[PDB]
């Protein structure tokens, strides 16, 4: 997959990514350059995204989360909701090809009292 739990987001160079950088609020958004990098954020009740995912030059799916401790609300590091499920989005099948067998479900989620509507691919 290769799964891999990842480190604090930090700043990624404005010349290493191929494609868009998705961040998960848990809602899938697309972040950009200056005012695509600095993905610094704490958990999204307070802060912008739980984690992100992109793709470097070498064709490797790069991820970043926040410091690891619904349990996703407490500590989630991006697209993966459970070990068996991740948040669906356009570049999901690029960024996560091993998951093409996953069944997709529509779900609801509350973060800091605001409702998010997401699609999830599970197992």
């Amino acid at each position, epitope marked *: 997959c290769w799964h891999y739990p990842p480190r604090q987001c930090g700043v990624v160079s404005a010349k290493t990514v191929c494609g868009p950088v998705y961040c998960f609020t848990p809602s899938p958004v697309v972040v950009g350059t200056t005012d695509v990098f600095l993905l610094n954020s704490t958990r999204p009740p307070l802060g912008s995204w739980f984690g992100c995912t992109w793709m470097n030059s070498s064709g490797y799916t790069k991820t970043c989360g926040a410091p690891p401790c619904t349990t996703y609300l407490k500590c989630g590091s991006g697209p993966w909701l459970t070990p068996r499920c991740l948040i669906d989005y356009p570049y999901r099948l690029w960024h996560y090809p091993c998951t093409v067998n996953y069944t997709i*479900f*529509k779900i*609801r989620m509350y973060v800091g009292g*605001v*409702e*998010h*509507r997401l*699609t999830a691919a599970c197992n």
Partner: antibody, heavy 118, light 114 residues
């Protein structure tokens, strides 16, 4: 916040057809099923059908097959209910609602009042 | 189609009293793979649109008072309001959200005795 804004009241002659709209905000309708339900005056609730805006795929109560058609335009976050060959018996309030995978109707528009009359 | 039947057709209780209403489905609403019952309860205040109270027979919707309590399983379901408030006057509907077409009960009209 999940919100459903429905179009305005309709007068429509018998035999005629009408198209209602349901516009969502604060979320993307792709991630929901949009349902339509009707409520005849002083009466109960009745499911018409639903659509998967990610799919285009729709499901109906067979009794409404031929008279109702649900569609959705994801670029404007709007779903539609087209009704055709209306009669006085279709005079009703038409609601749209969101569900997740569960099909329980978790959020509802304000409703659209449709009068069928000559 | 699954037939939903609600009881009673109307209710009148004074504020503070416990309210009880029931819902019978023509067959089980129990998802075996899930162990959940796909029954929902809705509240419709006069002139307003229906609003979801309970789903999966007992899971209470976010933002709904704790006095609202759904229970039961199999083919027998109840919604209870532990101590009723003046603002709770409404029609209440059960719905099986198990299989198409997702059918509703005929509704219980709740009024306030004063």
């Amino acid at each position: 916040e999940v919100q459903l804004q429905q179009s305005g009241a309709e007068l429509v002659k018998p035999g005629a057809s009408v198209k209602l709209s349901c516009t969502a905000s604060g979320f993307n309708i792709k991630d929901t099923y949009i349902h339509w339900v009707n409520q005849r005056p002083e009466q109960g609730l009745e499911w018409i059908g639903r659509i998967d805006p990610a799919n285009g795929h729709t499901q109906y109560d067979p009794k409404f097959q031929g008279k109702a058609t649900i569609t959705a335009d994801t670029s404007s976050n709007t779903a539609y209910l087209q009704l055709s060959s209306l009669t006085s018996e279709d005079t009703a309030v038409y609601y749209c609602a969101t569900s997740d995978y569960s099909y329980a109707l978790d959020s509802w528009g304000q409703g659209t009042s449709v009068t069928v009359s000559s | 189609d699954i037939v939903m039947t609600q009881s009673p057709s109307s209710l009148a209780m004074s504020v503070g009293q416990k309210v009880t209403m029931s819902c019978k489905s023509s067959q089980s609403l129990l998802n075996s793979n899930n162990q959940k019952n796909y029954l929902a309860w809705y509240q419709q205040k006069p002139g307003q649109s229906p609003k979801l109270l309970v789903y999966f027979a007992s899971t209470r919707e976010s933002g709904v008072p704790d006095r609202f309590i759904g229970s039961g399983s199999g083919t027998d379901f109840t919604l209870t309001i532990s101590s009723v408030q003046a603002e709770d006057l409404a029609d209440y509907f059960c719905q099986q959200h198990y299989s198409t077409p997702y059918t509703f009960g005929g509704g219980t009209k709740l009024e306030i005795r004063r």
